[PDB]
Design a protein around this ligand. Structure first.
Ligand code: ANP
Ligand code: MG
Lengths: 359, 385, 319, 52
DNA sequence: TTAGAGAATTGGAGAGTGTGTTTTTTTTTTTTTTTTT
DNA sequence: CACACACTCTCCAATTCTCTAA
């Protein structure tokens, strides 16, 4: 059984989420993990049971969805071009297309230009995001010792510079990803926590953002504005890529092989270029050294770079305007037209190319 | 369990306003202007639907050593509806409202048009002070929890009472300081009375001889007053006359020339309605408006101290901003750094620069100078632009 | 058709844009540039989703600042009375989880906050400078990314907060210290100072002809506008259905007006800005779209960018 | 087409002369058409009654 | 045509079989989040 | 376990039906 509840972005605010019991049978069991947004197809059914009829006082029947398939609502979701139960699967005619483009002279600089293609400039951030989004290779040495393969990235800089838009793009683009923000993220909402059941009423583990992003990315917006007690929960999952709980007689270690991308502002809200880094930021050497690419963003005035940037932002609003051979195919030639003005490579191909290169 | 002609006996009278004042609380010695204003709070101003409302709000302030709490008792005895409580007397949600295993309701609610009496108001916790702005400014409360999304009408005339913090209230120093209470909540009261007197024989010879006068034996509408109030609140609904308008403006201009926020004009309008509802007059006139002023002048005159600021202290903050400017520039000239430890900042600024300024004022001026961006604070460390 | 004849009578009018800023907050005397801002906030810019899956904010954020006496909260009273999907809240009563969302137990779940309860409408925040900075920072995602995202106990989540913010503030010291640019009067830092689209300073500078006019309004307000609230509400619901387009002469004009804002804000040897970021370029787009919505026109003229640019200068220039 | 069922009709009376409070409810009025004014504290799932 | 003797069907005594019932539920520790400290 | 209730099974006699002679 799976209790399936309404998605909090479709649930109208201040009104309760509804749920249904879903039943998974042979070959559908173990397909979805607690906390995913899931889409089910199935048979809606009902049966008599006396407890309803007893407590409700009417001849009323419980209802159950016998599941016939499951899909996980990853990707951008406002998209007609992405059929099937797995949006990161490829076909043979797609793998052959990855092999073709992988031997384009300058494929790295095409892929980097295609990271957040509607964000102008910032090629060092796009470079750092590309590296973190593909990752390195994890290593184990005679069984005795292990080395971290994930690349962690800190976007440090001034306001209104697409640090948060770069992170919200990586949440659409990465295979498994989780997003968290400042005072909204706790030490054990990251990491993991122990739950007590109301019925059987003994202890169990609930996985946090660094488990639900395992073999994936965790995106930490406004990392400077976390509580230091919450921010210091990350130190094990950066290097050892594990979460070692010992609480309530549960003593164990979860795996937590995420890449972490973080976005922060300097002290006083602005970068001050005459100071050393350790004075521009409220962080310290053990957490600053766990990040293995640092990007500093300075929003300096310049009369020609601000023409090139303002031109790109104006054109990006006009191109993205919601009022700019059958319709379900015919919308895809205009979506393809608009996307290929900006990007060297289709976004649907780059999502599958990244998952293919990772796996 | 457990006639109209009588209104006319009172409503015709020459002495009427003073009669009612001397009979709402007949044990209480003098404090005549406190009685006179509380009386207008019982009737209240006027109301309309389609904003402002006929609720009135009063604060008493002064030493714990006096009968002002006994007034707060008489008002709870006289008033239709109403509740008596005090500042420390519950959690915030116990004074407003809460949700349970379903409405919990507190002293600030279920008293529409009724006097919410509160004592110890100076020592109410600040989280509980921060309950009142939606009630005192919009007559209403908002909540959303556990599927409930809701608003509740609070609609109470507050009668508050407060002590000085610690010792006797000093008369030189300001009312904002001496209660330790925030001006945007204080400015929200329609009247504030300093209920204070000195040791004074030519009063106290009378007061002691009055207080002991009660024990000697085996005009006062002792019930008919609360019924007179009830019938006045049922029947009488004043309106501004054109001959009232010219004075309400002229007096507000006089007070602005003299030092008067528009909250004073809103207080004058609602009091001049209550002073026409008293006398049952149903119409507001020059002779009513002039008492609404005279009561406010007797309250405030007896610059409005917002942000706990004073003219003779904001000039000091600007001199402290200049003191930081010069003190850091001369050290940048003579010493081998543009930065100094906060210990050496208190050991320039506090030791010989000026009369003794504590670290909290330095941190204020310096923070407002971070906002202007002329020094950088790091961690204990401070460095010139 | 009884209502369609009123919308026909409105859109035809030679001067409707003037009639709209005069019908806003009619109980408040003066402050006509704030009336104009509040109208534009209720119309909003067009929300846009990019071919890269990146979302762009359409909603406008207004900050009103001034003396603790000078009428600012009467706008918040008005807006929460007039506009659908709206809430009132304030700074001393605030918390990070009160504003955004909290986590409740006894299993964990979401309790909706002030910025979710106002999703697709206006969150009015009073006492804003008196809000604890540890609780102020909680809205930086909900102001710009228009979502609140959470990781606590067993309940990770992402929630909508497609809300316009209207914030009322007092200077640090009560009096707007006229010797200072806005950036120094107010305890806000560049991260949030750059989120608000435009700021209005409003004041009660004591002068007798103004004083007599204001007192005359407040006494006449006790039982003594070219459109009704029911008319203005129907006009707005109509205007909100347009999705204005930036014409080629407007696209090319907009880049030069942003350069002229951006050139002047530069400070120190590095030429760092403080107020002007590309959020202010996107603010000229949002404002010129709302200015077009009030005129009920589907296409943006460069004169609507000039009207947006003066609404941005009116926040910046104070010496 | 298949065969399509009997339609069930919800007759919805409205605009009664008088409104009762939850405290005005008395068993003497069982089986009689009232109108009731109140505020919702909870709502259940939408469930199927076995009707026929 | 009444009335009385013999045949058929129904009522219910009572014997037989089968099922459910005690019943509690605060207290005390451990945790994780909000806020009022 | 054992003792009440819920429910079915079976037999016996009580009543009414039907035919005959007084
Ligand atoms: N280089 C850029 N190219 C295009 N658009 C940009 C660029 N920089 C910023 N923007 C846009 O302006 C807004 C600011 O980006 P955002 O990601 O919200 O700022 P940020 O860098 O995270 N600043 P902050 O939240 O204050 O720390 C978004 O709408 C972006 O789309
Ligand atoms: Mg950001």
């Amino acid at each position: 059984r799976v209790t399936l509840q309404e998605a909090p972005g479709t649930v109208p605010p201040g009104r309760l989420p509804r749920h249904r019991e879903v039943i998974l049978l042979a070959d559908l069991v173990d397909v979805s993990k607690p906390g995913e947004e899931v889409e089910v197809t199935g048979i809606y059914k009902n049966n008599y049971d006396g407890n309803l009829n007893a407590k409700n006082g009417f001849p009323v029947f419980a209802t159950i969805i016998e599941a016939n398939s499951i899909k996980r609502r990853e990707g951008n979701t406002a998209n007609e071009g992405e059929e099937g139960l797995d949006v990161f699967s490829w076909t043979e005619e797609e793998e052959r297309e990855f092999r073709k483009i992988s031997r384009d002279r300058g494929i790295i600089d095409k892929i980097i230009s295609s990271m957040a293609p509607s964000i102008y400039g910032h090629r060092d951030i796009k470079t750092a995001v590309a590296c973190s989004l593909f990752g390195g290779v994890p290593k184990n040495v005679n069984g005795k010792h292990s080395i971290r393969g994930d690349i962690n990235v800190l976007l440090l800089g001034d306001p209104g510079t697409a640090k948060s838009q770069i992170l919200k793009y990586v949440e659409k683009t990465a295979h498994r990803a989780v997003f968290a923000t400042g005072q909204g993220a706790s030490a054990v909402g990251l990491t993991a926590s122990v739950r007590k059941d109301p019925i059987t009423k003994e202890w169990t583990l609930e996985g946090g953002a660094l488990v639900l992003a395992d073999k994936g990315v965790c995106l930490i917006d406004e990392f400077d504005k976390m509580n230091d007690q919450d921010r210091t929960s990350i130190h094990e999952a950066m290097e050892q890529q594990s979460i070692s709980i010992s609480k309530a007689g549960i003593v164990t270690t979860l795996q937590a092989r995420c890449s972490i991308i973080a976005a922060a502002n300097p002290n006083g809200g602005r970068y001050n270029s005459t100071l050393p880094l350790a004075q521009n930021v409220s962080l310290t050497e053990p957490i600053l050294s766990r990040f293995d690419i640092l990007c500093v963003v300075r929003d300096l005035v310049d009369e020609e770079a601000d023409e090139r940037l303002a031109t790109f932002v104006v054109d990006s609003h006009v191109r993205s305007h919601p009022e700019n051979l059958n319709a379900r195919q015919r919308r895809l030639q205009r979506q393809r037209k608009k996307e290929e003005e900006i990007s060297p490579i289709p976004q649907e191909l780059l999502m599958k190319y990244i998952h293919y290169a990772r796996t | 369990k457990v006639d109209l002609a009588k209104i006319r006996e009172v409503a015709a009278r020459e002495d009427l306003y003073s009669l009612l004042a001397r009979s709402i609380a007949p044990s209480i010695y003098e404090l005549e202007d406190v009685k006179k204003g509380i009386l207008l709070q019982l009737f209240g101003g006027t109301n309309k639907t389609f904003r402002y409302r006929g609720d009135i709000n009063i604060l008493l302030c002064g030493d714990p050593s006096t009968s002002k709490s006994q007034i707060l008792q008489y008002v709870h005895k006289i008033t239709p509806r109403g509740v008596y409580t005090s500042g420390k007397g519950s959690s915030a949600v116990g004074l407003t409202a809460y949700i349970t295993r379903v409405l919990e309701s507190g002293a600030l609610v279920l008293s529409d048009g009724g006097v919410c009496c509160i004592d110890e108001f100076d020592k109410m916790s600040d989280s509980t002070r921060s309950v009142l702005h939606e009630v005192m400014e919009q007559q209403t409360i908002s909540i959303a929890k556990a599927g409930i999304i809701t608003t509740l009408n609070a609609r109470s005339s507050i009668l508050a009472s407060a002590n000085p913090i610690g010792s006797r209230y000093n008369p030189n120093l300001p009312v904002t300081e001496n209660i330790d209470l925030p001006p945007p909540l204080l400015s929200r009261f329609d009247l504030v009375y300093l209920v204070l007197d000195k040791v004074d024989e030519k009063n106290d010879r009378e007061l002691a001889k009055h207080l002991t006068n009660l024990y000697l034996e085996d005009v006062l509408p002792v019930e008919f007053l609360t019924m007179y109030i009830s019938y006045a609140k049922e029947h009488i609904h004043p309106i501004i006359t054109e001959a009232a308008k010219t004075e309400l403006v002229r007096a507000y201009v006089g007070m602005r020339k003299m030092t008067a926020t528009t909250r004073q004009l809103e207080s004058m309008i609602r009091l001049a309605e209550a002073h026409a509802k008293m006398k049952l007059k149903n119409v507001v006139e020059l002779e009513d408006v002039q008492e609404a002023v005279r009561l406010i002048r007797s309250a405030i005159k007896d610059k409005i101290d917002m942000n706990l600021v004073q003219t003779g202290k904001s000039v000091i903050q600007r001199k402290l901003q200049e003191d930081l400017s010069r003190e850091i520039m001369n050290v940048l000239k003579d010493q081998a750094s543009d930065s100094m430890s906060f210990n050496e900042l208190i050991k320039q600024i506090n030791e010989h620069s000026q009369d003794r300024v504590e670290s909290s004022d330095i941190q204020e001026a310096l923070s407002r100078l971070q906002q202007e961006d002329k020094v950088i604070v790091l961690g204990g460390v401070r460095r010139s632009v | 058709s009884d209502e369609i004849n009123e919308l026909k009578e409105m859109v035809k009018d030679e001067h409707i844009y003037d009639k709209l800023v005069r019908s806003i907050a009619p109980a408040v005397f003066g402050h006509e540039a704030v009336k104009k801002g509040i109208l534009l906030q209720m119309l909003g810019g067009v929300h846009k989703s990019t071919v890269e899956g990146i979302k762009l904010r359409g909603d406008i954020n207004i900050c009103v600042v001034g003396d603790p006496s000078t009428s600012k909260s009467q706008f918040l009273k008005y807006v929460v009375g007039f506009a659908p999907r709206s809430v009132y809240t304030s700074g001393k009563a605030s918390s990070a989880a009160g504003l955004t969302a909290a986590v409740v137990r006894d299993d964990y779940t979401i309790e909706a906050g002030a910025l979710m309860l106002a999703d697709n409408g206006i969150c009015c925040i009073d006492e804003f400078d008196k809000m604890d900075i540890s609780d102020q920072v909680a809205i930086h995602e909900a102001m710009e990314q228009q979502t609140i995202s959470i990781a606590k106990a067993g309940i990770h989540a992402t929630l909508n907060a497609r809300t316009s913010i209207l914030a009322a503030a007092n200077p640090v010291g009560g009096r707007y210290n006229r010797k200072l640019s806005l950036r120094g009067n107010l305890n806000m830092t560049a991260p949030i100072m750059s989120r608000f689209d435009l700021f209005f300073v409003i004041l009660d500078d004591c002068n007798e002809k103004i004083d007599t006019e204001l007192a005359s309004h407040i006494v006449d307000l006790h039982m003594k506008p070219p459109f009704s609230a029911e008319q203005l509400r129907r006009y707005i619901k109509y205007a909100r259905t347009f999705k204005p387009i930036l014409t080629k002469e407007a696209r090319s004009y907009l880049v030069e007006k942003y350069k002229e804002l951006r050139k002047d804000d530069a400070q120190g040897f590095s030429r760092s800005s403080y107020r002007i970021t590309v959020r202010q370029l996107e603010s000229m787009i949002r404002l010129s779209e709302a200015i077009a919505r009030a005129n009920c026109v589907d296409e943006i003229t460069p004169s609507f960018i000039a009207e947006a640019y003066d609404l941005l200068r009116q926040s910046i220039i104070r010496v | 087409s298949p065969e399509q069922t009997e339609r069930v009709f919800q007759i919805s009376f409205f605009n009664l002369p008088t409104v009762h409070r939850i405290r005005d409810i008395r068993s003497e009025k069982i089986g009689s058409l009232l109108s009731i004014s109140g505020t919702v504290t909870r709502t259940s799932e939408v469930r199927p009654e076995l009707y026929k």
